[PDB]
Amino acid sequence: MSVIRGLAAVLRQSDSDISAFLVTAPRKYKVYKIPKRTTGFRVIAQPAKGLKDIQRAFVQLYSLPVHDASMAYMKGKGIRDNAAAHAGNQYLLKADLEDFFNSITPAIFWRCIEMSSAQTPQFEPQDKLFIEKILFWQPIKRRKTKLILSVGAPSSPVISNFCMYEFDNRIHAACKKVEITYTRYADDLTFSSNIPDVLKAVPSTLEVLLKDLFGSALRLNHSKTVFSSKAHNRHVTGITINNEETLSLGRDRKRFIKHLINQYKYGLLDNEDKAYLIGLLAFASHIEPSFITRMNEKYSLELMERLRGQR
Amino acid sequence: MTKQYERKAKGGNLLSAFELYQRNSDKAPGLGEMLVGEWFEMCRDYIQDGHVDESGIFRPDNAFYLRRLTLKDFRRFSLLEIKLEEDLTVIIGNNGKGKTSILYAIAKTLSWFVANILKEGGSGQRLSEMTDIKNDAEDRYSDVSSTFFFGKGLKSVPIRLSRSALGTAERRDSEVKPAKDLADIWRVINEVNTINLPTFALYNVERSQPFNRNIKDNTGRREERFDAYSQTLGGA
Amino acid sequence: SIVEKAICSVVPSISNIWVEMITGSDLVKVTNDGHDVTIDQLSDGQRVFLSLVADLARRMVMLNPLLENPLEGRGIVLIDEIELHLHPKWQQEVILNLRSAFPNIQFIITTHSPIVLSTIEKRCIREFEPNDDGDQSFLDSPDMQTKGSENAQILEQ
Amino acid sequence: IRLSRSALGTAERRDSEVKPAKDLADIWRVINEVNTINLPTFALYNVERSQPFNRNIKDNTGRREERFDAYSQTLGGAGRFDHFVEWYIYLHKRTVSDISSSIKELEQQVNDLQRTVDGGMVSVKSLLEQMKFKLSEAIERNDAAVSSRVLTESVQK
Amino acid sequence: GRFDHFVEWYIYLHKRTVSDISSSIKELEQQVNDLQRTVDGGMVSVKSLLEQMKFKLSEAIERNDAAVSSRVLTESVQKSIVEKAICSVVPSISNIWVEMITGSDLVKVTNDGHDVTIDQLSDGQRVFLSLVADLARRMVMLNPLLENPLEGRGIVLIDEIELHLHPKWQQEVILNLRSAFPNIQFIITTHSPIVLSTIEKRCIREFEPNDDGDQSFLDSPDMQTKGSENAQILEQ
RNA sequence: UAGUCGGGUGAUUAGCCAGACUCUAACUUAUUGAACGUAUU
Numbered sequence A: 001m002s003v004i005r006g007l008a009a010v011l012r013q014s015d016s017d018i019s020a021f022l023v024t025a026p027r028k029y030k031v032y033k034i035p036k037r038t039t040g041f042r043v044i045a046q047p048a049k050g051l052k053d054i055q056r057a058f059v060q061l062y063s064l065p066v067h068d069a070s071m072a073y074m075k076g077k078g079i080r081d082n083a084a085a086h087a088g089n090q091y092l093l094k095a096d097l098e099d100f101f102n103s104i105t106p107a108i109f110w111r112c113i114e115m116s117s118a119q120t121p122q123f124e125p126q127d128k129l130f131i132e133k134i135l136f137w138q139p140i141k142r143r144k145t146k147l148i149l150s151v152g153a154p155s156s157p158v159i160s161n162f163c164m165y166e167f168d169n170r171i172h173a174a175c176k177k178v179e180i181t182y183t184r185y186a187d188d189l190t191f192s193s194n195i196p197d198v199l200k201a202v203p204s205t206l207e208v209l210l211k212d213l214f215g216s217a218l219r220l221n222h223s224k225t226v227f228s229s230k231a232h233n234r235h236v237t238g239i240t241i242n243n244e245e246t247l248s249l250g251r252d253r254k255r256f257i258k259h260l261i262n263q264y265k266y267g268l269l270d271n272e273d274k275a276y277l278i279g280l281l282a283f284a285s286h287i288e289p290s291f292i293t294r295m296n297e298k299y300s301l302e303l304m305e306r307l308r309g310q311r
Numbered sequence B: 001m002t003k004q005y006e007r008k009a010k011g012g013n014l015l016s017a018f019e020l021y022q023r024n025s026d027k028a029p030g031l032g033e034m035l036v037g038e039w040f041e042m043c044r045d046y047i048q049d050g051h052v053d054e055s056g057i058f059r060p061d062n063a064f065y066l067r068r069l070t071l072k073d074f075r076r077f078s079l080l081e082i083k084l085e086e087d088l089t090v091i092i093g094n095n096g097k098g099k100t101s102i103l104y105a106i107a108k109t110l111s112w113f114v115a116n117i118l119k120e121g122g123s124g125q126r127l128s129e130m131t132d133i134k135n136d137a138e139d140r141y142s143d144v145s146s147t148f149f150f151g152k153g154l155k156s157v158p159i160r161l162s163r164s165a166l167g168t169a170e171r172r173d174s175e176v177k178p179a180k181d182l183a184d185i186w187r188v189i190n191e192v193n194t195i196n197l198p199t200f201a202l203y204n205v206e207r208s209q210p211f212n213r214n215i216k217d218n219t220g221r222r223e224e225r226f227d228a229y230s231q232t233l234g235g236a
Numbered sequence C: 001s002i003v004e005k006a007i008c009s010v011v012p013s014i015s016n017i018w019v020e021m022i023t024g025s026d027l028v029k030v031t032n033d034g035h036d037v038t039i040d041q042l043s044d045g046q047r048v049f050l051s052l053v054a055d056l057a058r059r060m061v062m063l064n065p066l067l068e069n070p071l072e073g074r075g076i077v078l079i080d081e082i083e084l085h086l087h088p089k090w091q092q093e094v095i096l097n098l099r100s101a102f103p104n105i106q107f108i109i110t111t112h113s114p115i116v117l118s119t120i121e122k123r124c125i126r127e128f129e130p131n132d133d134g135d136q137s138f139l140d141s142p143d144m145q146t147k148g149s150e151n152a153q154i155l156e157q
Numbered sequence D: 001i002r003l004s005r006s007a008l009g010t011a012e013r014r015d016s017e018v019k020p021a022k023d024l025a026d027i028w029r030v031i032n033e034v035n036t037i038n039l040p041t042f043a044l045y046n047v048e049r050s051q052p053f054n055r056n057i058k059d060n061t062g063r064r065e066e067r068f069d070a071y072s073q074t075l076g077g078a079g080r081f082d083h084f085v086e087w088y089i090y091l092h093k094r095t096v097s098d099i100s101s102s103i104k105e106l107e108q109q110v111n112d113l114q115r116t117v118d119g120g121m122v123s124v125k126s127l128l129e130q131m132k133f134k135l136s137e138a139i140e141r142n143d144a145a146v147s148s149r150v151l152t153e154s155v156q157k
Numbered sequence E: 001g002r003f004d005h006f007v008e009w010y011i012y013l014h015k016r017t018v019s020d021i022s023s024s025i026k027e028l029e030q031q032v033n034d035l036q037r038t039v040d041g042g043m044v045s046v047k048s049l050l051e052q053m054k055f056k057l058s059e060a061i062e063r064n065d066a067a068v069s070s071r072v073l074t075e076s077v078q079k080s081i082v083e084k085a086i087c088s089v090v091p092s093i094s095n096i097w098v099e100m101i102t103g104s105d106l107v108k109v110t111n112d113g114h115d116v117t118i119d120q121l122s123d124g125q126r127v128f129l130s131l132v133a134d135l136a137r138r139m140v141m142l143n144p145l146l147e148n149p150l151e152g153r154g155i156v157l158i159d160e161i162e163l164h165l166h167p168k169w170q171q172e173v174i175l176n177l178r179s180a181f182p183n184i185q186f187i188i189t190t191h192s193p194i195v196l197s198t199i200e201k202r203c204i205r206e207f208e209p210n211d212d213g214d215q216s217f218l219d220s221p222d223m224q225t226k227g228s229e230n231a232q233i234l235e236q
Numbered sequence F: 001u002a003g004u005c006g007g008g009u010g011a012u013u014a015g016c017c018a019g020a021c022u023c024u025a026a027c028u029u030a031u032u033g034a035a036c037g038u039a040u041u
């Protein structure tokens, strides 16, 4: 029974129950809007609890290959590693893909399964429909053919990382030859090098590789292709890179944190802002450990200790 | 949420301040007076702040100009980028190189700003599906991406005009929402309290037409202020 | 008064502009080279430039009521072939006059003339490579400093 | 149904609410398309109704006959009396002539040209490319006249 | 100039070149021969209302002798002359023809190796193309008795000959016009010294800078403009 | 010169002080989901 048998063995449920559940599974999604940070809203499709558990079990059962250049949605790796990969360089070529998650269709997934250069788990032809129903979301009730990955789902990140495995491999191989390091936080192609005038040809390589692999399904966002140098601001996925080639939160965010700590010093900070400040300080300690020491020196050690609390 | 918008607005962001002002105004009159609020004053100061420099010219605190223009499969350009200057940009070349095309694309982009200043959610001009797309092409669609600068509070206003060729099953859409948001800010702040509005004009080859005052031109009372946006990007 | 001052300052030949009501059709008169002439007897080159300047000044004045000088308001103006119907003497000062009258306007301009380029900084010029078919990306400024240079040198380089 | 307009530069718009009217008219149109029904007559007659009659009428034959021509310029304020004259003359022409013979000669040219089809050229389609289905379309257009549908020309007149 | 008239005339020429009269008059004769034998026995009802085409045969006989009696050039010859006049004068245009795209016939040109249509032409190329095309059409239509109708008498007045023209094109706009139309007296006005560098000093009439209209004669410049430097012509 | 980086002061997102950089060239973004940091645990 293959996939359904393993899902039943993991969920401790009968095959009939799971099979009946996986009939309108591409449709069992709750969609909502979250507020954008400046203005507008973002639409997210989140599956139901049962489908979420099914997707988690399917993800843990089958291990799809991922590349080392990818930095999103893996254990032990995240924003700090992605920023530190290009920390010591001089020039960067942050680029983005156009509608990355909703451009992935079951056709793309099955095309990537067969031609993957690394090991790929064997899916029987009988269970491919169940795979499509488990992994993919179906917007528009009337259209049963439109199946896309939903940004935000227990299974979408790993599928998205796997679908770009060949792209990541080929891009990394091309970039290492020309002394360019490449990382991708699942939508942010980051290229950096110390050689001048070497990043100009990278976007054309990206376009031709995307056309070769995904055809017209995946495209670059030309408005999101940015060239930066030490003469201008340099930040990778939220972490500023200094002219001293070290990670930083940015001067503005550091001054904001300083103002928050000063407000806490005179007791003008409420509980919500206090919790936000504690979270920001933990994130800063993760990203910029020296900032915590500087704040301890500036605002005394006892004030900081009382602010972060004790165990 | 209100807390995040307040944190961003007190830092100088204009979009967050306008969002806070709108959410206060549309609420009960306890927090919404349509004006005389912190966020409305922040927005109007952001729009209206300036100082007279050493030469006697008023310089606004937050200048407005176009930063980048990208032309993808537009007329003769497969993919072109420009780095428009803050004060004066000159485009030179032989005949049939695309300078008029660049000006035409910029005017089409500015038409959305003009329309949404005049009219809420107004529709600007769109790329032609018969002539604007490159004849050779590979996907039979064209994109015109623009980024605008409106001070440190609004460092980027990305607007993209897209059109697909005739007889294409897949039609490409335009991303014009940020221009609508900025023009909504301008229009709402102006109606609540008069502010200085930007000028968008195009003077193409359609100028130099003969004669003047051809007809009485019953067209909308030239005296009223918003008559300055009428046919402003028409070319003549 | 503001519109009249702008028109007289930018357009070189025009010294004054006003409206006559006697002969009771309403008509606008200008002064070209010391001669009072009506608006319809202008030449192509003094009427086109005056039309551009007058329209821009009207829009600036109407859209900037809270400015001491409304022409100092912000905006974007697109001009195609600025040297249209202009003698080489006029081309030597059109850019300077436009930039002086409207200092906060972002001017994006195309031209076929070294005379106009002689009054423009090298950094403000975006040139097309002569052997280009549309595959070139991210236009560049020229190498030779056009501002204050010889017209023949600008034609050469 | 509400017809709304707002001034330029207002922070919020005032839009029309013509959806119920569109729904009722969609009901009318769809029902009529599937099966012919009686339609309402909307007309407006202003003081421009008093205009001189210009003797002869432009012979723009081909459009005064269709049913939906009754809505052409129906709310312009002046009735299309020239359209009425053309329609009335058309009805008279179909009553005094073209109806005593009815479909007697129109189908005869097919048999007559069958001689050229058989004993003339090997195959003839260029000479008989229109009337063969023109007779069929005339029949399916006059089926309304011959049934409990669109009235005959004589009774209309 | 009436460029729309030129486009209609050019499409007429293309249609009558691809159709011709020898492929229609013989068909009319064959149809008449078939029908007359068919109606030989009787029942002339198949010809009474078909007599319209038989009379149109004689109508087509008319208006065709005028094409033989007036010694007018062949439509293909006129098309070739107009095409070679257009391509040899306009630098960017390589060839011009008519295609039946989606039924309608539209004129296409070749600019820098690409096959854009007329509506996609830039203003600099389109205006010069319209001028040369209208002049060539008028010369061909008014000079039917010449081997080359472009070598005919006439007086052509052009204002601002360098209009919309790049300086590279101004160096060859006078020579091309003179070579294409040798027997026309050209009276032109210009604002560019690049054009004057290709013109004899004897052919130039100048207005003095200090001139309010009291002068009585237009003199030639003292310096020889032909073959001179651009700076020298600008200065003297 | 701009612009950028950000060590310090500053009831502190502002202002100021010192220092530094400059491929034609950042524009700081998104949750409840995924991973990361932190806290309970």
Ligand SMILES: Nc1ncnc2c1ncn2[C@@H]1O[C@H](COP(=O)(O)OP(=O)(O)O)[C@@H](O)[C@H]1O
Pocket (backbone or CB within 6 Å): B074, B075, B076, B093, B094, B095, B096, B097, B098, B099, B100, B101, B102, B131, B132, B133, B134, B135, B136, E111, E114, E116, E120, E121, E122, E123, E124
């Ligand atoms: N859709 C198109 N596809 C390909 N080439 C085009 C298209 N539209 C115009 N062109 C070409 O691109 C040029 C456009 O000219 P234009 O933008 O007016 O330039 P300029 O102002 O420099 O003369 C011409 O050479 C024209 O033939």
